[PDB]
Design a protein around this ligand. Structure first.
Ligand SMILES: Nc1nc2c(ncn2[C@H]2C[C@H](O)[C@@H](COP(=O)(O)O)O2)c(=O)[nH]1
Ligand SMILES: Nc1nc2c(ncn2[C@H]2C[C@H](O)[C@@H](COP(=O)(O)O)O2)c(=O)[nH]1
Ligand SMILES: Nc1ncnc2c1ncn2[C@@H]1O[C@H](COP(=O)(O)O)[C@@H](O)[C@H]1O
Ligand SMILES: [Mg+2]
Ligand SMILES: [Mg+2]
Lengths: 241, 231
């Protein structure tokens, strides 16, 4: 099995490569942001539970025919509430450094110190709450920035370890957005492929919306033409490996 | 941080190699069996409390001025409760596939299938229960063979990633004893270094480094220094 980490800003063609590979080769995919979406979909269902709030499922968090920028009109309090349930869920996948979960009959809650950082981080955010802003808050503003910088790479490793000895030719991680995550991928022998559109950028100011450095060893597919030309560049990059 | 997995049989000089590196370089060390002894020591205190049993600290589980070959005279029934407690300890580190721990008023317990699975496994162990056997029972008869082949490597993966930005030059895992675990180690980018004596061990695959311990300690030291130079 070969471990491939793709890198590319929004609309660079990185997403097309990902899809080209998944359908023309024996490949298994792992999204670093997978568990983030899972944790939110579970937290939502718990929040919106017996409310009149829109029912948002995993498919909506996946953005499948749902716009994730759609303002959800949430208050910082609701959001804190959601973030706390998301944590309870995740703590169950893999322990988050400094978080404990307590139970009061189906009512899970995080320890005060962790509840306090969530509170503090959220109160400082003045953006509007979209499915997209909640993903960035959970993943980056909270977890990476304040609890465990390597948490999403860690859940990745647990998946990889269950899968490396299977019959797939490739194992693809398409959504890495932080440099330190690329660093771990590289330490682990991953082949990093950057899909680049000559002089281009993604409209998001999040650091999860910016472009990662090409370090040596990194391969690069320059998407400066037709789609057929992208497909050839991809077939030829992979044949190299 | 260079990830190194050491391989070698008893007396090959593999342990001497782990020591010399720990002593001479910026390195951190991780034992795949660490958690096994931590959970047994945890599950022990809990059990040997109730009873009129000896006191086994984490320092004896380590074999620190204690013989782990020693028979503790345990019933298959006490071994099973011990094991169920160790599973409760472990599950808090990383979920063991198909295990759920429920609190029973200051009594965590494992779901019934996991519980029964432990019962059947412990029930066919016709050996006498020493510390050394509790470790294999826990580590291999139970977890590796019946719950998750890769569970001890998973725990390593979590600690390794944690120490990732720590400024250590090497991360050494010296106690792998199973080949499937070395495969996992190679899938994570580890360099495998075997320490062999001239004239039944883990296989030497292509890409693995081999240090032949054929001379003096100091010749062994020199081979190590030059091997680390090349990674
Ligand atoms: N890969 C990754 N995504 C993150 C991280 N922290 C937060 N995210 C969020 C921000 C993105 O807009 C979102 C990606 O969702 P998606 O578009 O479905 O792949 O995940 C992180 O550490 N890594
Ligand atoms: N590396 C490794 N060690 C294991 C595994 N299962 C059990 N062990 C234990 C049994 C040995 O007695 C022990 C070594 O402990 P020690 O003597 O404290 O260094 O490793 C396993 O899957 N991998
Ligand atoms: N190449 C060597 N030359 C001389 N003594 C050695 C050599 N390698 C190992 N030793 C001895 O072998 C012992 C056992 O090896 P080990 O437990 O595998 O580390 C050590 O404690 C050393 O004193
Ligand atoms: Mg909950
Ligand atoms: Mg317990």
């Amino acid at each position: 099995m070969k471990l491939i980490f793709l890198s590319g800003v929004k609309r660079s063609g990185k997403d097309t490569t990902a899809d080209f590979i998944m359908s023309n080769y024996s490949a298994v995919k792992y999204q670093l942001a997978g568990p983030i979406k899972d944790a939110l979909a579970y937290a939502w269902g718990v929040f919106a539970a017996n409310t009149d709030y829109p029912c948002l499922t995993r498919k909506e968090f996946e953005g499948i025919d749902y716009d994730r920028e759609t303002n959800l009109n949430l208050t910082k309090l609701e959001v804190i509430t959601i973030m706390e349930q998301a944590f309870c869920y995740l703590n169950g996948k893999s322990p988050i450094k400094g978080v404990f979960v307590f139970d009061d009959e189906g009512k899970e809650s995080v320890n005060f110190v962790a509840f306090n950082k969530i509170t503090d981080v959220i109160n400082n955010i003045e953006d509007q709450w979209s499915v997209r802003r909640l993903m960035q808050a959970l993943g980056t503003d909270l977890i990476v920035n304040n609890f465990d910088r390597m948490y999403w790479v860690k859940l990745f490793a647990l998946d990889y370890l269950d899968k490396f000895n299977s019959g797939y030719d490739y194992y693809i991680v398409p959504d890495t957005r932080q440099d330190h995550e690329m660093d771990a991928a590289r330490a682990m022998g991953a082949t990093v492929i950057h899909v680049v559109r000559p002089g281009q950028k993604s409209n998001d100011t999040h650091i999860t919306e910016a472009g990662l450095p090409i370090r040596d060893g990194d391969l690069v597919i320059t998407n400066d033409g037709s789609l057929e030309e992208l497909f050839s560049k991809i077939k030829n990059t992979l044949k190299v490996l």
